[PDB]
Ligand SMILES: O=P(O)(O)OC[C@H]1O[C@H](OP(=O)(O)OP(=O)(O)O)[C@H](O)[C@@H]1O
Ligand SMILES: O=P(O)(O)OC[C@H]1O[C@H](OP(=O)(O)OP(=O)(O)O)[C@H](O)[C@@H]1O
Ligand SMILES: CSc1cccc(C)c1Nc1cc(C)ccc1C(=O)O
Ligand SMILES: CSc1cccc(C)c1Nc1cc(C)ccc1C(=O)O
């Protein structure tokens with residue numbers, strides 16, 4: 001195998017042979033790839049139209065190189081709540097707020113996260129601002145999960161060999177297939193999740209990767225462009241269960257949610273988004289809460305997939321009570337306290 | 342303009358706006374583009390399918406940055422004989438031998454040329470092996486042209502600012518839109534040429550660039566994959582004249598040429614290819630001679646373009662006579678002697 005062989009095949013608009021995508025990604029992760037080669041591969045893989053098999057090979061190499069958590073430290077029903085980012089809408093941190101609520105409802109959460117790429121404050125940035133430690137290693141994340149009910153895996157910390165690739169990506173700016181890999185490479189390997197995809201035409205491929213792993217996942221894309229379940233309009237959901245994918249459209253109005261305007265979900269810097277978290281967890285009613293409760297419920301539905309309508313109802317009930325009882329506010333405080341010890 | 346904008350447009354499989362290819366190439370030539378960006382552009386432009394407008398902009402930037410020849414030193418009817426290479430056959434240097442014959446027939450030839458990419462020898466390398474000085478500045482190429490009847494512009498010598506692009510070309514290996522630019526960027530700007538193209542789907546694009554310039558050119562592709570008029574099988578000729586492009590098929594056997602086997606046109610190292618030049622110019626008959634006579638005749642038809650079958654007949658006569666009189670052998674000896682001075 002070689003770069004001229006693989007790049008040539010891609011520029012011929014042909015799918016790769018089995019193992020070729022993995023070879024390429026392994027060359028990239030081990031530092032044996034030139035930036036020009038990394039870039040050529042990223043762009044070519046994107047314009048050919050990647051397959052689930054191919055993207056799965058990429059994610060697989062990353063996970064084969066990632067720092068794992070210790071054995072028997074991640075509950076079999078742990079869930080992730082994370083998105084690709086890149087929706088260019090710059091919102092409050094919906095996945096992170098949902099994650100907290102979900103944990104507070106008693107679903108174990110091992111969250112994969114990262115700083116912002118284009119937004120003002122990403123999940124990792126806002127958690128930082130809240131006083132939550134984002135620098136924890138495998139053992140401490142494992143302890144966080146057991147002691148608090150939530151663990152945060154900071155992507156750069158668990159995927160050190162990915163730096164070469166990430167660098168090239170910033171240099172070229174355009175989204176590529178690599179923009180899918182974040183959600184697909186949680187190092188704790190949870191089997192369930194609510195997974196945001198900003199790219200409507202690649203979400204199905206992402207779902208395909210999760211199906212192959214037999215995860216219970218909702219891959220979500222808001223029809224307004226959000227890599228979240230949105231409240232401003234309908235969302236597209238690729239529901240992954242029993243190794244199968246099926247495309248659905250979801251309308252929150254069916255569950256009594258009023259439509260919101262995108263500006264109502266708008267975020268700011270880390271201090272502002274941190275304030276927004278506290279407000280929701282503090283019981284503030286409004287569009288931000290509604291969006292949080294919806295995405296939380298979605299994660300719980302994914303967890304249950306390990307009955308659609310009853311599952312959503314139960315999820316909305318549980319997510320709302322987790323906030324109203326103070327359990328979610330208390331969990332964030334305990335999470336902060338955990339790191340300070 | 343910006344890289345995320347331009348690259349985003351290409352990955353969305355859209356043609357660029359007027360001026361965007363030029364901005365990109367200008368960033369590349371002025372050392373303002375990172376290797377990753379260069380590569381991403383080359384690959385993205387290739388897989389979108391470049392237009393004649395876009396490739397003409399690339400070539401135009403290169404020519405706007407090139408060392409020119411002194412004013413009033415390039416005959417208005419000068420011709421080029423050159424191809425893309427990248428045919429992966431390692432043949433004898435047909436364009437270079439053809440170029441000598443054409444000059445010997447009294448048609449001024451300013452040849453754009455370069456060392457080999459994958460071939461064992463290459464045009465510029467074979468000339469060196471023959472004692473010809475390839476690394477001459479603008480002033481001396483002009484003198485060579487006036488005194489000998491032929492001039493060689495060494496692409497690296499006249500296009501220094503292309504160095505960044507050439508490096509990335511090497512690293513990624515795969516042919517890209519950049520592989521079209523050599524024949525399109527002769528710094529002497531001849532208005533006629535026999536132009537070889539190894540990429541059948543891109544030959545029409547090259548033809549359109551010459552058409553926009555109102556050049557008189559035959560863009561040629563051997564149906565055996567040769568970036569020359571072949572003697573193995575038929576050939577596809579995009580004829581360019583009066584700003585219009587007419588595609589047509591060409592069979593050498595219609596002029597008495599026996600079909601040869603590509604083994605017979607095979608090449609070797611510089612010393613080997615240099616020997617083959619001396620052999621053809623010395624009167625040796627066989628498949629190599631025939632191919633040289635055919636391509637030389639093609640260049641002469643292109644020159645005439647500044648009647649199809651009659652032009653080819655006169656072209657074939659003039660080519661054969663230029664060898665048979667010894668004029669081509671003599672012109673090479675004088676070309677060598679010119680360099681030793
Ligand atoms: O800058 P962007 O490209 O727009 O990405 C915004 C954030 O969204 C993603 O994470 P995540 O879903 O976990 O964070 P969230 O809570 O804000 O939704 C990503 O890792 C970023 O942190
Ligand atoms: O290494 P390759 O990619 O296979 O290309 C072989 C040669 O052909 C091209 O020029 P040119 O047509 O002028 O040289 P020629 O005499 O061999 O035809 C190219 O510049 C190379 O020198
Ligand atoms: C230096 S960024 C990085 C570092 C290590 C691993 C990964 C996977 C990423 N990238 C992401 C991680 C997540 C969790 C979300 C998005 C991305 C991305 O860059 O698209
Ligand atoms: C470092 S190679 C180079 C250097 C300067 C200018 C050019 C245009 C090229 N490239 C070519 C020039 C010719 C004449 C033929 C082919 C190529 C090519 O790169 O494929």
Ligand SMILES: [Mg+2]
Nearest residue numbers: 082083095196
């Ligand atoms: Mg998110």
Ligand SMILES: [Mg+2]
Nearest residue numbers: 083085227228
């Ligand atoms: Mg988001």
Ligand SMILES: [Mg+2]
Nearest residue numbers: 423424436537
């Ligand atoms: Mg040639």
Ligand SMILES: [Mg+2]
Nearest residue numbers: 424435568569
């Ligand atoms: Mg050739």
